[PDB]
Amino acid sequence: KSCTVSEEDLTTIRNAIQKASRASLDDVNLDEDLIAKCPLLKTITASLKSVASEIATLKDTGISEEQVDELKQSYEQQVNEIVKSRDIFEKQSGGDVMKEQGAMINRMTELQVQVAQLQQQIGEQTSRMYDDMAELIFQRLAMNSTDSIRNYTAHMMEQKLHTLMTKLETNYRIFLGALRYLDHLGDQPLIDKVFDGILKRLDEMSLETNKERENGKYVLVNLLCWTVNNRFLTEKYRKKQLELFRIALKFYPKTGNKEANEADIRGRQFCDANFPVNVITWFAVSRAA
């Protein structure tokens, strides 16, 4: 494709980016005629919408209202920085009077870069907050260390692990934060028990609604990612290999639908290994036969 933008349409794009930064953070709505002459704008539109959805997802979490407000200000301040960019939106002056960066495709490319970097920046910010939220869950449930779980009976340990799973599973970013928290803590007896608790939840949870299947798929796929390149966790996978095969075929039953299932699995991964796809669509399908 090619991108052409008229002088007045660039002004319209600038205001639409401003409007998506403040208050309700609504979808950037632009005329289709304008989008057609420059399909790059779909990418920019989708990126700002993703950050808005991610911020809204933070609200329906146990995060401090101060924390969410502080993140909303950072997002708005950073979009305002893009809006004030003379390289993107304002007329060339002085030295760059007839530089090539004044052409539309170059202005829009720099807009793509700054919005992509904004998305990465906000992503790193929310990742830290999901780290904190995950840690708070372990602390509130009094299972943040080997010492805290040492004196739990088997029945109590099972009960704590179930409660933990019901809190981690509803938001995969919280689940990822829990794995990062356990990794940094380096408390292996706790990792051992959390692995057992994840498996038990995956083996028994209800799957009646789409929300439950989505929650379970993210947990299953990223539990497998968690074992990659880790001897202790790979050893845990090895011993419970057959149970994970049963779990994989429950979430991904249409074995003959290899291509669609693989695309679904890779879209939920946060490692880059083939291992989750291989377990679910290859190993488990071969063992059942």
Residues 6+ apart with CB under 8 A from 47: 115, 116, 118, 119
Cα–Cα distance between 284 and 278 in angstroms, integer?
Answer: 8
Cα–Cα distance between 30 and 60 in angstroms, integer?
Answer: 29
Angle 65-83/40-59 helices, nearest 10 degrees? 160
C-alpha dihedral, 69 to 72 to 76 to 78, nearest 10°: 110
Cα–Cα distance between 185 and 181 in angstroms, integer?
Answer: 6
Phi-psi domain of 25 (left: phi exceeds 0; alpha: psi -120 through 50; beta: other):
left
Cα–Cα distance between 129 and 69 in angstroms, integer?
Answer: 13
Give one DSSP letter per residue of 11-54, joined into a string: HHHHHHHHHTTSTT-------HHHHHT-THHHHHHHHHHHHHHH
C-beta of residue 32 within 8 angstroms of C-beta of residue 145 = no
C-beta of residue 121 within 8 angstroms of C-beta of residue 78 = yes
Indicate the residue type of 71: L
C-beta of residue 281 within 8 angstroms of C-beta of residue 237 = no
Q: How was this structure determined?
A: X-ray
Count Cβ atoms below 10 Å from residue 170 Cβ, excluding itself.
16
C-beta of residue 28 within 8 angstroms of C-beta of residue 45 = yes
End-to-end CA distance of the chain: 47
Cα–Cα distance between 182 and 289 in angstroms, integer?
Answer: 36
Residues 6+ apart with CB under 8 A from 193: 143, 149, 157, 161
C-beta of residue 78 within 8 angstroms of C-beta of residue 146 = no
Rounded alpha-carbon distances, angstroms, from residue 218 to 14, 117, 168: 37, 26, 11
Rounded alpha-carbon distances, angstroms, from residue 240 to 24, 162, 194: 47, 18, 14
Cα–Cα distance between 178 and 156 in angstroms, integer?
Answer: 20
- Report resolution in angstroms: 2.3
> What tokens does 90 get?
């304002």
